[PDB]
Design a binder for this molecule. Structure first.
Ligand SMILES: *[C@@H]1O[C@H](CO)[C@@H](O[C@@H]2O[C@H](CO)[C@@H](O[C@@H]3O[C@H](CO[C@H]4O[C@H](CO[C@H]5O[C@H](CO)[C@@H](O)[C@H](O)[C@@H]5O[C@H]5O[C@H](CO)[C@@H](O)[C@H](O)[C@@H]5O)[C@@H](O)[C@H](O[C@H]5O[C@H](CO)[C@@H](O)[C@H](O)[C@@H]5O[C@H]5O[C@H](CO)[C@@H](O)[C@H](O)[C@@H]5O)[C@@H]4O)[C@@H](O)[C@H](O[C@H]4O[C@H](CO)[C@@H](O)[C@H](O)[C@@H]4O[C@H]4O[C@H](CO)[C@@H](O)[C@H](O)[C@@H]4O[C@H]4O[C@H](CO)[C@@H](O)[C@H](O)[C@@H]4O)[C@@H]3O)[C@H](O)[C@H]2NC(C)=O)[C@H](O)[C@H]1NC(C)=O
Ligand SMILES: CCO/N=C/c1ccc(OCC[C@@H](C)CCN2CCN(c3ccnc(N)c3)C2=O)cc1
Lengths: 245, 58, 290, 58, 43, 58
């Protein structure tokens, strides 16, 4: 009654029969902006079906020597579907997300992942190596899009913060002896109630193998990791022509 | 006590015991605040809250 | 004016309970019972474990009267930490003419910055204090003018400028024989919280390598410029330093995040040393020893 | 509170929340004043006030 | 003469029923029923 | 008087006449305390208390 689930929203459902449990980030569901909070005076659009779908984005192969990946949300979906068309026309934006990452393996493979969220995941550099040149990260390390980006130094998460206490932020583990998926429901976290969808990326989805993959030779050596996400309770405002960046 | 509601802690039901001498509430004392804590939104923010005694994966 | 049933049908899980002291430990006994197990948790749920003391070991009735008031945010942050230092030397390169514009960024010193980077969004009032003295430490009979330049106000460009008339800016005239000038500062940001971390760019357009200087720079956090001059037409005959201490009051903090372990290198970016990534703790030679 | 009415803001019905220590009202605090505004004497000071919805020149 | 709550709080499973004769065998019929199985024990 | 109970003299029934200006009770005055004394726990802490008039070793 906990191992088996089904998440239907929009026209797309996903079934899982070896889940762990759904955690709701910071204990509350995504919701619409109340009139106590809103400052924009134009009526928002709320598509309510066409953008609240599980978008399956990409597939990272996980071998025995991987480091970890990250996806900046919502810039994984400003190139995809009716979410990517409404977020490019409209200046303002708010939504929550239901984030579901699948990674199946046999009952002989082993290894654990820490799929975790963290809001305002800013990216530092190696500062020129020795630490004296103020190098800023490029635009693709900042906002990789639906392609994702691989961590260089996952012990410090490319930001000088340790991964050992990433477990404070909303997370759950995918260890291949127990579960194969990890649902994380995230509300809209930001100070101001709407923001731009092209500039500001509210959070980043860190997916790091902490305990590495291991399997005896003869088993299937290709163990993919696919993340599917669904913008919940999304609404846009401030209509103008299409910007792409 | 005829001050403006200028403090950056407005947004709760109860007030605090902060003594103030000027007409602006942000110039007041820090005072003592309420000892309410909610660890369950960081410790176990699960959807269907399972108890201690049961096995978590039935 | 509709006949459809689709449109006419078209919330927190946790309750903050009051907890002044840590919770008591009720008396438990042994238990030899199948079916229910309080030890075996599932850490892959991503929940911290709700196993208590009583269901692991036979405990006694301990009335816990240990208060939890020292650990609130108003007791953890309301300590005046050094966030700025302003030099006004007699002769040199850095400010040789007795004025200095220090733009208010309190992420320049790593003890106040380390604590407030635990949280992502913080909303607070602050009371700044300006302890000023000669570089040897002694106090001299010298008059100073501090003034606060908001974003858009004219920055003063010299000691004998026109912007020091402070027709609408707030300004403080204190001499160094006086106690340190202490003024309280409200929550001034346009957003509802000072975000210490802004993963994004402030301006639209293409983002080339020349304008990656804007990355992580949110305009809701940069709240202006703090300017200080020695009051006079002539040059003052005393070298000066002005140390700025601020304590935070009426604090509300949201969304905790991991605390920095690498050394800070610059302001307003988390850049860290690349070859010198040090471990977050100390180390030992083997795991089976101490 | 046995002061003289010396302040240059006498001429309204309500008083203000100004603390004073001397016997003269002009030495008092500036205080906080009433948040009443009348934009219609500068915005539309017309004789016969026309509404928003109608065309202004019938 | 104590204030502690540890000290103030500080049995057979089977009942011998009378059985003069061996027990009777009541009438049973067939059963085609999932869920419950009386044969498969755990030794 | 909305202070915290921080003083190192909490543990009696009666309070003391200590004037305080901060929100912490240990910053208060020393005040005047109760003039109760018990010499019998240092003078004659015997099990069965014998009187003055009788010989102590009957
Ligand atoms: C002029 O001149 C010049 C100079 O020379 C030249 O150049 C050249 O070029 C060429 C071409 O390109 C080249 O060659 C190539 O190479 C490549 C590479 O190699 C490298 O690398 C690798 C990598 O590794 C990785 O992975 C692994 C696993 O796999 C792991 O373990 C590791 O760790 C790593 O990891 C990493 O990375 C990753 C990526 O992804 C990531 O993710 C992670 O994270 C990490 O970081 C390596 O390994 C290698 O190594 C090597 O070496 C060393 C030394 O030190 C050793 O020790 C080792 O062992 C090795 O060796 C081995 O191997 C190799 C291979 O690799 C071989 O060759 C040798 O012999 C030995 O055996 C390196 O470093 C590669 O890849 C390639 O190969 C390919 O090809 C060939 C022919 O061509 C063949 O034969 C092979 O087989 C292969 O094939 C494959 O692949 C493909 C593509 O990919 C595919 O498609 C196919 O299908 C196949 O697959 C298959 O098979 C396999 C087996 O193998 C299996 O497994 C699967 O499943 C399937 O079935 C090539 O070779 C070169 O290099 C260059 N050079 C140099 C010096 O380098 C030029 O060219 C000229 N010019 C003209 C015009 O000519
Ligand atoms: C005579 C007049 O005396 N006037 C005194 C006076 C004192 C203080 C003052 O404004 C104090 C502003 C601070 C309370 C907050 C500073 N903050 C906000 C978040 N932030 C960030 C966020 C993200 N990255 C970086 N780098 C920095 C940051 O640095 C104005 C006037």
């Amino acid at each position: 009654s906990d191992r088996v689930a089904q998440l239907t929203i929009g026209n797309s459902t996903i079934t899982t029969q070896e889940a762990a449990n759904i955690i709701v980030g910071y204990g509350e569901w995504p919701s619409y902006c109340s009139d106590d909070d809103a400052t924009a005076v134009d009526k928002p659009t709320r598509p309510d079906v066409s953008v609240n779908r599980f978008y399956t984005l990409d597939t990272k192969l996980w071998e025995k020597s991987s480091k970890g990946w990250y996806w900046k949300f919502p810039d994984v979906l400003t190139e995809t579907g009716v979410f990517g068309q409404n977020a490019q026309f409209h200046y303002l934006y708010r939504s929550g997300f239901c984030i579901h990452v699948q990674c199946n393996a046999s009952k002989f493979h082993q290894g654990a992942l820490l799929v975790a969220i963290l809001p305002e995941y800013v990216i530092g550099t190696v500062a020129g190596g020795t630490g004296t040149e103020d190098s800023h990260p490029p635009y693709i390390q900042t906002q990789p899009g639906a392609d994702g980006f691989e961590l260089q130094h996952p012990y410090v998460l490319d930001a000088g913060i340790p991964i050992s206490q990433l477990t404070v932020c909303p997370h759950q583990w995918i260890n291949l002896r127990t579960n194969n998926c990890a649902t994380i429901i995230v509300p809209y976290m930001n100070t101001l109630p709407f923001d731009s969808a092209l500039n500001h990326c509210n959070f980043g989805l860190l997916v790091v193998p902490i305990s590495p993959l291991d399997f005896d030779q003869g088993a299937t050596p290709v163990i993919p990791i696919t993340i599917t996400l669904a913008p919940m309770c999304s609404e846009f405002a401030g209509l103008r022509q299409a910007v792409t960046q | 006590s005829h001050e403006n509601s200028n403090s950056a802690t407005e947004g709760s039901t109860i007030n605090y015991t902060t003594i103030n001498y000027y007409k602006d509430s942000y110039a007041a004392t820090a005072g003592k605040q309420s000892l309410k804590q909610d660890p369950d939104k960081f410790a176990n923010p699960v959807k269907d809250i399972f108890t201690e005694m049961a096995a978590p994966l039935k | 004016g509709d006949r459809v049933a689709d449109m006419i049908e078209s919330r927190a899980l946790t309750q903050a309970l009051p907890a002044p002291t840590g919770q008591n430990t009720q008396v438990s006994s042994h238990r030899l019972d199948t079916g229910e197990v309080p030890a075996l948790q599932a850490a892959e749920i991503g929940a911290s474990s709700n196993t208590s003391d009583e269901s692991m070991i036979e405990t006694r009735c301990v009335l816990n009267s240990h208060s939890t008031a020292e650990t609130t945010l108003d007791s953890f942050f309301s300590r005046a930490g050094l966030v700025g230092e302003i030099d006004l030397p007699l002769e040199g390169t850095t400010n040789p003419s007795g004025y200095a514009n220090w733009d208010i960024d309190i992420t320049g010193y790593a003890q106040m910055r380390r604590k407030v980077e635990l949280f992502t969004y913080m909303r607070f009032d602050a009371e700044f204090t300006f302890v000023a003295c000669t570089p040897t430490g002694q106090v001299v009979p010298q008059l100073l003018q501090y003034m606060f330049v908001p974003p858009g106000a004219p920055k003063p460009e010299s000691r004998e400028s026109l912007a020091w008339q402070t027709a609408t800016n707030p300004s403080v005239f204190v001499k160094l024989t006086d106690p340190p000038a202490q003024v309280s500062v409200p929550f001034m940001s346009p957003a509802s919280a000072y975000q210490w971390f802004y993963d994004g760019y402030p301006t639209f357009g293409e983002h080339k390598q020349e304008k990656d200087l804007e990355y992580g720079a949110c305009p809701n956090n940069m709240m202006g410029t703090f300017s200080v001059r020695t009051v006079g037409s002539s040059k003052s005959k005393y070298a000066l330093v002005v140390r700025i201490y601020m304590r935070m009051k009426h604090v509300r903090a949201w969304i905790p995040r991991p605390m920095r372990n690498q050394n800070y290198l610059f302001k307003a970016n988390p850049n860290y040393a690349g070859d010198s990534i040090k471990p977050t703790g100390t180390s030992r030679n083997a795991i089976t020893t101490l």
